Ligand binder design. Structure first.
Ligand SMILES: [Zn+2]
Ligand SMILES: [Zn+2]
Ligand SMILES: [Zn+2]
Length: 92
DNA sequence: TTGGATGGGAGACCG
DNA sequence: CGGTCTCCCATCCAA
């Protein structure tokens, strides 16, 4: 219930989830608390789990299978699967 | 045009 | 109340 409020008071932004507030604060601070560390791919995520879905790309865990016979295309994320599904089927 | 890939965000799961 | 996870968009990104 205790939404954590954005340091820059006037902004009036508030979120109980720390990750959310980090992602918010990143806009002002430029901070990215969840780095990937990996050489070259030294990415800076502002929230946990977004890092984990990114990790699907390192692990190669392509799995979000379009539920369409024959067109059983496997995508990296549910949203990518949805975009495809929309783009190719749910065009309406 | 397309699916791979990232910042941002409501909601689900767990405690 | 709050981290990890579930689920997703919009956008960026390389093909
Ligand atoms: Zn703010
Ligand atoms: Zn990485
Ligand atoms: Zn399809």
């Amino acid at each position: 219930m205790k939404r954590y409020i954005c340091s820059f008071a006037d902004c009036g932004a508030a979120y109980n989830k720390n990750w959310k507030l980090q992602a918010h604060l990143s806009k002002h601070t430029g901070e990215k608390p969840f780095p990937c560390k990996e050489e070259g791919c030294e990415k800076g995520f502002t929230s946990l789990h977004h890092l984990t879905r990114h990790s699907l790309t390192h692990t190669g865990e392509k799995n979000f299978t379009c539920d369409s016979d024959g067109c059983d295309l496997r995508f990296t994320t549910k949203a990518n699967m949805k975009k495809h599904f929309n783009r190719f089927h749910n065009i309406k």
